[PDB]
Write a protein that binds this ligand. Sequence first.
Ligand SMILES: Nc1ncnc2c1ncn2[C@@H]1O[C@H](C[C@@H](N)CC[C@H](N)C(=O)O)[C@@H](O)[C@H]1O
Length: 457
Amino acid sequence: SIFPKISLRPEVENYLKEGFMNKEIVTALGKQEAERKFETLLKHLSHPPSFTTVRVNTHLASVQHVKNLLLDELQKQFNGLSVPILQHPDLQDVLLIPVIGPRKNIKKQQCEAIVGAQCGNAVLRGAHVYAPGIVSASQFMKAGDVISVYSDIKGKCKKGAKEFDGTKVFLGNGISELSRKEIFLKGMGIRMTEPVYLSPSFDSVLPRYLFLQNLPSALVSHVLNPQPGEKILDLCAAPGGKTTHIAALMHDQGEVIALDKIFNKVEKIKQNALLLGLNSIRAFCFDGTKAVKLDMEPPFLPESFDRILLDAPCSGMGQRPNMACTWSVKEVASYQPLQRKLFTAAVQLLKPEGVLVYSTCTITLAENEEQVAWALTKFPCLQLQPQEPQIGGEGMRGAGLSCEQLKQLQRFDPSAVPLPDTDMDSLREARREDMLRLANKDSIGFFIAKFVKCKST
RNA sequence: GCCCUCUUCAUCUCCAAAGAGGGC
Ligand SMILES: Nc1ncnc2c1ncn2[C@@H]1O[C@H](C[C@@H](N)CC[C@H](N)C(=O)O)[C@@H](O)[C@H]1O
């Protein structure tokens, strides 16, 4: 609608096309209908999801208790403006907050600010512009003036640049907390008083009760279905959104092991675990590809966990909003070998009759369905299983999988439904039945696979 | 000032990158 397609290098944009126009997909659909769904996908990755999704930490407060407190917070932020807060009927701990946008009649100001590409995404998701996110502002920008915020999506603007002619995209207007001289540090930089997409700010709303998580990511731990008193492993876990979710589903009864290769990233897990009141979590900085111990705290012996979650590192191109990804084709393909190494460690560490859930935050066939076919061939002890709840679409063709196997996977296609232009007259002219499905389809690009280990090794 | 590479950290919701070297 409002934003152009995701700016991809000519090499990577065709690398995705080659996978989305494979012989398996263009035979089921049409050759003209296969490219239409691919170019529609490229147009949707630039836009934010039409819903804000929050996960209630049920170990410290109720869904009924946090929803009421969120209504109190939403009226303060929106100044009487009442946007509903739905509750997902399939995910008991997730609340849905519809996005108001895109607004297209916003008058642009002469005072400007450029922010980082990732900071620009958070603005489109309801965040304000804090101090370390501004990359450039107008020369002598007065503290307290209404300012036009733009996202440096190519990430090419140097810090403190007086001007910037490169590709920038309008994010809305707001009044600034600080001056340009004071910027070029923490605190509030630019309070978004008129964003293109309207959604609540969740910076420090209810740190012990909430966790802002995408719907397909909160669905992951539900699909994993941990049980109280089980030994669960989160191989790639930081910052621990799913790890804390798994601990909450077990009522903190059991053992949840969390790993990640970066020291500070692991510290975030420990803070989030303590902040949300989970004591069953134990986080370690460790290479998951080396987490298997043998004859001669990680590493662990094989067949040691009841369930294992591999939210593997990926190309991350199933992210929304994503208006520019300047990666190489080699950097996008950089994740396939590392995924297969982490997968091999999980299969060995999983107990017999254990459950393994594999998930990515990208859209590529080589990282989602091709890995499932590779796993079920290299690991005869594994067997694909149906998922509960089933929220996303079927698996994508091109990996030579069954129709019964594709029906068992959950791939979230942002191309599934058209982008809505939600103003406040639209919700008052809509039913709760339609918005629940829109939240299940207008999601980020995501993939979920679930296996079970038949025999031992 | 404009344009390029390269090294890592990074967007999987909210304090959001900073180095190296080239061309005009
Ligand atoms: N060899 C490794 N061992 C452990 N963790 C890794 C390894 N390589 C990458 N990672 C982590 O894997 C994560 C990739 C993410 N997709 C997982 C994030 C996490 N599931 C979340 O809820 O946000 C990153 O945080 C990486 O730091």
